Amino acid sequence: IVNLQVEMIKQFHMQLNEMHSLLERYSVNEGLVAEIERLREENKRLRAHF
Amino acid sequence: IVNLQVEMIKQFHMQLNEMHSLLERYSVNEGLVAEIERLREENKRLRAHF
Amino acid sequence: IVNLQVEMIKQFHMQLNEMHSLLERYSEGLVAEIERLREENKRLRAHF
Amino acid sequence: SPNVLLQNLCCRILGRSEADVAQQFQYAVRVIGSNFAPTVERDEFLVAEKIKKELIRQRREADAALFSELHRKLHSQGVLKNKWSILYLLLSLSEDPRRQPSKVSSYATLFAQ
Amino acid sequence: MATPDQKSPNVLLQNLCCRILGRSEADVAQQFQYAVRVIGSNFAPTVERDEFLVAEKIKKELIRQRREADAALFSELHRKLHSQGVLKNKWSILYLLLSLSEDPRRQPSKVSSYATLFAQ
Amino acid sequence: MATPDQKSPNVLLQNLCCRILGRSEADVAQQFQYAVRVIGSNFAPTVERDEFLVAEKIKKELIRQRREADAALFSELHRKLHSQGVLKNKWSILYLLLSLSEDPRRQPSKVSSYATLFAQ
Amino acid sequence: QKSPNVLLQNLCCRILGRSEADVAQQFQYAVRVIGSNFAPTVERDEFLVAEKIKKELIRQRREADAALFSELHRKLHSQGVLKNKWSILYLLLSLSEDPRRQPSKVSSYATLFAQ
Amino acid sequence: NLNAVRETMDVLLEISRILNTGLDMETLSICVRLCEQGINPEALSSVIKELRKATEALKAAENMTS
Amino acid sequence: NLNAVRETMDVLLEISRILNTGLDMETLSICVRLCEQGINPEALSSVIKELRKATEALKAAENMTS
Amino acid sequence: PDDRSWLEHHVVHQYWTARPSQFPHSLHLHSNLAAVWDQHLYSSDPLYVPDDRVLVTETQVIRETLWLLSGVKKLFIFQLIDGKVTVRNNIIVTHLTHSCLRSVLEQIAAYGQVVFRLQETEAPFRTYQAFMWALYKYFISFKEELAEIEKCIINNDTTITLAIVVDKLAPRLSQLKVLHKVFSTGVAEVPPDTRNVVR
Numbered sequence: 001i002v003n004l005q006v007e008m009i010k011q012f013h014m015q016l017n018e019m020h021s022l023l024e025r026y027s028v029n030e031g032l033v034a035e036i037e038r039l040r041e042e043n044k045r046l047r048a049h050f
Numbered sequence: 051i052v053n054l055q056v057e058m059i060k061q062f063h064m065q066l067n068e069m070h071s072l073l074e075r076y077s078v079n080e081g082l083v084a085e086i087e088r089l090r091e092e093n094k095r096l097r098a099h100f
Numbered sequence: 101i102v103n104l105q106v107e108m109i110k111q112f113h114m115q116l117n118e119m120h121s122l123l124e125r126y127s128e129g130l131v132a133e134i135e136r137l138r139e140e141n142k143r144l145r146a147h148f
Numbered sequence: 149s150p151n152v153l154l155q156n157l158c159c160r161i162l163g164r165s166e167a168d169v170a171q172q173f174q175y176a177v178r179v180i181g182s183n184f185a186p187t188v189e190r191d192e193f194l195v196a197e198k199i200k201k202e203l204i205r206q207r208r209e210a211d212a213a214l215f216s217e218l219h220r221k222l223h224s225q226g227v228l229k230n231k232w233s234i235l236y237l238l239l240s241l242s243e244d245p246r247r248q249p250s251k252v253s254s255y256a257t258l259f260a261q
Numbered sequence: 262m263a264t265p266d267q268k269s270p271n272v273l274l275q276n277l278c279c280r281i282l283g284r285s286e287a288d289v290a291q292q293f294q295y296a297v298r299v300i301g302s303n304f305a306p307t308v309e310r311d312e313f314l315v316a317e318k319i320k321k322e323l324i325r326q327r328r329e330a331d332a333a334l335f336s337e338l339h340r341k342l343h344s345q346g347v348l349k350n351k352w353s354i355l356y357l358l359l360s361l362s363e364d365p366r367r368q369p370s371k372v373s374s375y376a377t378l379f380a381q
Numbered sequence: 382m383a384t385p386d387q388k389s390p391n392v393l394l395q396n397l398c399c400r401i402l403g404r405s406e407a408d409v410a411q412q413f414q415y416a417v418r419v420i421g422s423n424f425a426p427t428v429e430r431d432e433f434l435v436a437e438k439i440k441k442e443l444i445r446q447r448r449e450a451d452a453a454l455f456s457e458l459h460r461k462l463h464s465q466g467v468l469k470n471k472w473s474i475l476y477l478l479l480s481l482s483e484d485p486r487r488q489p490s491k492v493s494s495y496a497t498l499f500a501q
Numbered sequence: 502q503k504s505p506n507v508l509l510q511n512l513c514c515r516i517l518g519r520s521e522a523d524v525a526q527q528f529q530y531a532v533r534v535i536g537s538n539f540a541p542t543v544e545r546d547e548f549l550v551a552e553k554i555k556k557e558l559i560r561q562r563r564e565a566d567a568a569l570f571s572e573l574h575r576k577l578h579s580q581g582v583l584k585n586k587w588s589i590l591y592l593l594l595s596l597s598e599d600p601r602r603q604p605s606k607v608s609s610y611a612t613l614f615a616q
Numbered sequence: 617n618l619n620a621v622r623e624t625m626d627v628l629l630e631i632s633r634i635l636n637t638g639l640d641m642e643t644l645s646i647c648v649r650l651c652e653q654g655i656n657p658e659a660l661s662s663v664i665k666e667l668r669k670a671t672e673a674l675k676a677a678e679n680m681t682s
Numbered sequence: 683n684l685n686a687v688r689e690t691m692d693v694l695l696e697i698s699r700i701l702n703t704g705l706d707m708e709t710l711s712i713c714v715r716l717c718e719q720g721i722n723p724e725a726l727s728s729v730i731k732e733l734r735k736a737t738e739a740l741k742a743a744e745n746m747t748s
Numbered sequence: 749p750d751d752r753s754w755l756e757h758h759v760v761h762q763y764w765t766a767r768p769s770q771f772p773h774s775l776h777l778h779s780n781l782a783a784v785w786d787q788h789l790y791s792s793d794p795l796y797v798p799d800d801r802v803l804v805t806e807t808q809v810i811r812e813t814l815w816l817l818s819g820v821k822k823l824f825i826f827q828l829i830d831g832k833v834t835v836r837n838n839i840i841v842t843h844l845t846h847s848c849l850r851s852v853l854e855q856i857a858a859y860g861q862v863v864f865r866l867q868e869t870e871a872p873f874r875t876y877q878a879f880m881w882a883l884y885k886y887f888i889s890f891k892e893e894l895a896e897i898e899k900c901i902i903n904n905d906t907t908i909t910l911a912i913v914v915d916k917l918a919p920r921l922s923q924l925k926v927l928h929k930v931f932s933t934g935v936a937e938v939p940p941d942t943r944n945v946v947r
Contacts, residue, residue: 001540004105005057006728007182011109012061013533014526015116020072026124029079036085043092050099051425057538059418064499064536102184106662107303109178114171149746150653151613157646162671163678172670177614179663180655183731187658190602195657203635211634218631222648225624227617229652230605236657237647241664242635247310248352252669255270257676259301303669370430370473375390379421382840383789383796469797490545493720498506499536505721508712509729516709516730517737527736531729539724569700576693580686588723589714593694595727597701605654607738612746615739 151177187236192223195235199242206244274300291381307356312343315355319362326364394420411500427476432463435475439482446484509535542591547578550590554597561599570597624648638668690714704734763808764824771805773842782842801840809841810901810910816860817917818894819867819887826857831865833857852910859921862928865936873944879935886927893920 024030154176158169166173189195196219203212219235228234243249268276278293279286286293309315316339323332339355348354394416398409406413429435436459443452459475468474483489503511510521513531517524544550551574558567574590583589625645632639639647650660691711698705705713709730716726756762761769777784782803789796804825816823816833826833835853840846867887871880897916901908914921938947 001054001101002542002724002728003183003185004101005054005537005539006534006731007105008057008061008108009533009537009728010530010732011112011178011182012065012537013529015112016065016068016072017526017529019069019116019120020076022120023072023123024076026120027073027076027127029082030076033079033082033085036082036089040085040089040092043089043096047092047095047099050096053538053540055422055424056419059415059422060536060538063414063418064533102182102658102662103303103305103665105182106175106179106666109182110171110175110666111302113174113178149612150608150610150650151746153646153649154610154613157643158667158670160640160642160646161667162674164674169670169674172667172674175666175670176663179666180610180659181614182659182662183735184656184659184662187656208634211631214634215631218627221627222624225620227621227624227652228648230654233655233657233660234648234651237651237660237664238631238635238637240657240661241637241639243637245636248350250306250310250353251350252672252676253270253300254676255274255300256673257680258269258271258274259297260673260677367430368472370427371470373420375420378390378417382786382798382801383793384786384798385794385796386791387794491720493722495505495721495725496536498504499532503712505716505719508716509726509733512709512712513729513733513736515706516704516733517740519737519740523740524736527732527739530736531732534728534732535725537728539722539728542724542727545723566700569697573693573697577690580690582683582686582690583714583718585717585720585723588717588721588726589694591723592713592717592727592730593697593701595723596698596703596705596730598703600700600702605656607742608650608653608655609742609746610650610653610655611739611742615743615746 187233189236190232192231192235195232195239199235199239202239202242206242206246208245270300271297307353309356309359310352312339312351312355315352315359316340316343319355319359322359322362326366328365390420391417427473429476429479430472432471432475433459435472435479436460439475439479442479442482446486448484506532506535542595544591544594545587547586547590550587550594554590554594557594557597561601563599563601566597566600705730760808761805763802763804764812766824768802771803773803780842782840782844785845800838801846802836802838804839804841806841806843806910807901810908810913811898813856813910813913814894814898814901816856817863818891818898819863821864826853826860828861828864831861833860833864859924862924866928866931873947875944875947883931890920890924893917 155166158172159166275286278289282289320332320336395406395413398412399406402409402412440452440456554570628644763769825839871877
């Protein structure tokens, strides 16, 4: 029972990390967020230069 | 069996918290919304200054 | 206990995959809306 | 690699290609990856005796003799490095022909879709 | 010869959940999901796969509940059922019946209303 | 049907968490949730659902702990309680009390502060 | 007094011989296991754990290991430095390995999940 | 050595047939190779049971789709 | 106290060596300190087993990739 | 089953079956007297654990009472224990208190137990045969009135209450009590080992 519990906890940790990575991969507006921030910086630069 | 039940409840709680944290880190398009609003204001400034 | 553990691990894996698939399904619409609004604006400009 | 061999074994047993046995391969990998308590018997002779007793209990004395002969042949061949583990596995996978197979309810097929 | 449309075990299980809850199948969706989860789970082999051994265990259990008349009746009914030969899986049905027996003498440990919180 | 103004199971669980932790209910929210989870978890049937069997088990446990006087006191209190008829679920309360009995000689295994490390 | 979590992490890094970055999955597994509720150990009595270890070593015809275990237990009891002798005795019994039984070389198949 | 391996595999297949294990020659050879590499017999038994359940589900699906 | 600690650590190292536990002086000292400080022996044993399993998995991956 | 379930809902609820038939009733204080009593009890004692009570219809209670008085065995509410008719403890009616309902049902159960003892008569001898015949004629006469009451209940045109039925049966109930006492003295008080001539 102890071995089963320890294995289950290890698997839970691994699964949590894998789920975090999978959600990061499929949720991934982060690249879009970075591109929006870049477009904001470029528009700000065009405003400062005009 | 009692230990197993308690462990299962604890593991469920831990997994729920990890999923919450992963969704908060990776779903959170709030940064993307803020950057899009920033790019809109910056483009408006670049149009007004040109 | 070993049989239970193995079955539980398999079920956990299957459930994780199903949840991933459900989130992917529930999380193209933007592109279609953009295309529709672009079509609408082009139609308005041409008609005008 | 042992992993490819296990995948091929799953494919052969299931009669599907390795790509079609991915879930079964994952289940096998999960089962093997779980921490198991030490086996009750790591002695080849004890495992052989347990297998013989289990075969005799099913009133399969001919099958018990055949199993003993196969074990002797395997031991003399010297191909297997862990005789106790293989004997324990074979004992664990033996099925009593007299105990009517608990026919997996057609209902299990309902969830496969 | 069109063997009455014994709806597939999934449909039968849904109907059973609806019948047990006394709600329509649509109203038993959480219960239906729980049932589907249970049915898809790997179940251990029944304690006894011998029709006569299962019948003897049932008789012994009835005697243990001080239902000796019921134990004799159970043994007689088991003999009659074995002679009738209608059931194909006698061991499974006997194991099920044994599993479903309830001791009238043991005062029901009234399931705290709190168990309903997890049913949803 | 005499339903005592029983403050909701949630309030009782929160009060229990606050009492056990020595923190306010707001400070025991994780402990309150843990208690709710534990109560919501499926538990195996109690070892004894017979009031007298639970009392006898408590007496035997006290005797095994060399608390023979405490075993006699437990048996006498159980007899008095059964005659008093005040408790509605004598078997459940007796089983709980027996399970909660502690041998004063066996040093309480102080839950290591280390359990807090994983909460963050 | 390094925190037990930091000590366990350092122990894992030292035992595996890998950097923290290469043991991240293993570190997470260890943290999950340590934080997970475990069933009580087979023996929580120092004298009972010592006797069980001695009996197990004698039954396995490992007389040298049984003598070493008895000597270590005598030394631990006489030194009186450890407050929870039962925990250390239980750990040592649980971690004992038969020197005569050739280490079961981990089948290459475990590598499939490593990637 | 090859003749010894063949004899061992034939003996194992005969034992499996007499015991009604359902193992074929290739599966038996794979199991023997895995056991020689040190796999824990309890883990192997649990894996085998899960693989057998998956194979039975796949066979039932193939019989339903045919 | 220091001499007693050293003697205890030497005894523990000898026991580990006779039992072939694979523990070094630092890991054994950390485990001893944790147990003396009240750490649950089951948690400590699980942590040690997980670290050993991680080392074995890394060695198996290195041997399969080599 | 759908048409059968609709009929079962419209042909009178399975409350007579151990399946709990929940029926809509008026929450008016005069109509929710059981519910009002439950509320007061719930409000009054913090130690009070609410027992599970089965709600039964007044018409259903009347019908089961008539069936008991008709000599029917195996009633659901009234169980026969050691030849004594006993009410199931978890039964409640909307318009009665558990104690009041219990008292009325206890009187009815005592009369039913008397009938049951009288109903069990075998006639082994000529004199016992005559006594059985007379008992059968009496039970016929009682069953006639019981059937007429049942018919009036079946017509359902008029409100028939348990009190009304009890009052209608009061002379018959008194005759039954007198007959029960006389029969007990003439037969039940006769020792079993007495010679048939002596009996």
